[PDB]
């Protein structure tokens, strides 16, 4: 069985490149080999690249084109569909500078004044039919005609992909192939469109510590990350260094989130990542587009150790928790 050359192999960080069609269409031997490679990637790096996924390259290109049209909207039009609450987790956001006020404590005035917010904007789309949380869609006029149908379409295709990656994890684990289905069939996921504007390289010297997206771990089961060719995504190695996650054409970068890490009793890794300047020298960095589809267990799901991830009960690291409650706590914290 032929393994691909690793997508990343640096400083102890080995991110495998895996042909997903071999899980979806292989004979039983190839299917199991591929599933095990998928799992093993999650257990070690917490990240994998997938190629030959069921989402077609020209549709993905159309989705990026559609997202680029949204972000070209005037500022007033984007704020109209602004992010509201952690409970909804839907709409437009652009991080601003914190302000010094009467309430501010003198100890951190220096820090507030010197802080540099992430140079990015985002628009988040949840599933259409979640009770009490409608998506704030922009008006379908001119270039945004077709925006909703395209993004809903993409949402459902990523939703299907999530279900399939979890099946690969289950197969790799040697548990029931369909174990995760009833934990993820609702599709309580979040489609985050990202635009990192063109920025002069010097902004990064004027604001030291300035990034495009701050270091973090994702919250959910897995995240499907579709990046353009610009570069800048970095993943933390076992040795504590950020390593470039080079774009590879027509791949999806897939990482486990904090909930899956906990769910798996820490047999699966949720790995710190960030977006910085592209590794390339240049006076101006062009606009960078990515799309992060955050996958989650159903909000109603109760999360406790998956079978086969511990031997004795004393090996269980975590109390069971409700999935929905956990996520709102992560989203509301800041
Ligand atoms: O834009 C990227 O490449 C990564 C974004 C990301 O990690 C996130 O939104 O959680
Ligand atoms: O960037 C992290 C995340 C942000 N928003 C979410 O809904 N899930 C995440 O994992
Ligand atoms: Ni992330």
Residue numbers in the entry: -1 to 332
From the study:
Like the TET proteins, T7H is also a Fe2+ and α-KG dependent dioxygenase. Here we report the crystal structures of N. crassa T7H (NcT7H) in apo form, in α-KG-bound form and in complexes with α-KG and T, 5hmU or 5fU. Similar to other α-KG dependent dioxygenases, NcT7H adopts a variation of double-stranded β-helix (DSBH) fold as the core. The active site of NcT7H is located at the front end (opposite to the back end) of the DSBH core and partially covered by the α10 helix at the C-terminus.
The crystal structures of the full-length NcT7H in complex with α-KG (NcT7H-AKG), and in complexes with α-KG and T (NcT7H-T), with α-KG and 5hmU (NcT7H-5hmU), and with α-KG and 5fU (NcT7H-5fU) were solved by the MR method at 2.1 Å, 2.05 Å, 2.35 Å, and 2.15 Å resolution, respectively. In the substrate-bound NcT7H structures, T, 5hmU or 5fU binds to a pocket adjacent to the metal ion and α-KG, and has largely hydrophobic interactions and a few hydrophilic interactions with the surrounding residues. In the NcT7H-5hmU and NcT7H-5fU complexes, the uracil moiety of 5hmU or 5fU maintains almost identical interactions with the surrounding residues as that in the NcT7H-T complex. The C51 atom of 5hmU and 5fU is located about 3.7 Å and 3.9 Å away from the C1-carboxylate of α-KG, respectively. In addition, the 5-hydroxymethyl group of 5hmU or the 5-formyl group of 5fU forms a hydrogen bond with the C1-carboxylate of α-KG and a hydrogen bond with the side chain of Arg190. In the substrate-bound NcT7H structures, the side chain of Arg190 makes hydrogen-bonding interaction and/or van der Waals contacts with both the C1-carboxylate of α-KG and the C5 modification group of the substrate. In the substrate-bound NcT7H structures, the C1-carboxylate and C2-oxo groups of α-KG are located in opposite to His271 and Asp216 of the HXD/E…H motif, respectively, and Wat1 (which occupies presumably the oxygen in catalysis) is located below the plane formed by the C1-carboxylate of α-KG, Asp216 and His271 and in opposite to His214, indicating that the α-KG binding assumes the ‘off-line’ mode in NcT7H. NcT7H exhibits comparable Km and kcat values towards T and 5hmU but displays about 1.8-fold higher Km value and 2-fold higher kcat value towards 5fU, and the catalytic efficiency of NcT7H towards different substrates is in the order of 5fU ≥ T >5hmU, which are consistent with our binding affinity and activity assay results. The side chain of Tyr217 makes hydrophobic interactions with the substrates; mutation Y217F has insignificant effects on the activity towards T and 5hmU but a moderate effect on the activity towards 5fU, and mutation Y217A has moderate effects on the activity towards T and 5hmU but abolishes the activity towards 5fU. Additionally, these mutations abolish the activity for 5fU, leading to undetectable Km and kcat values.
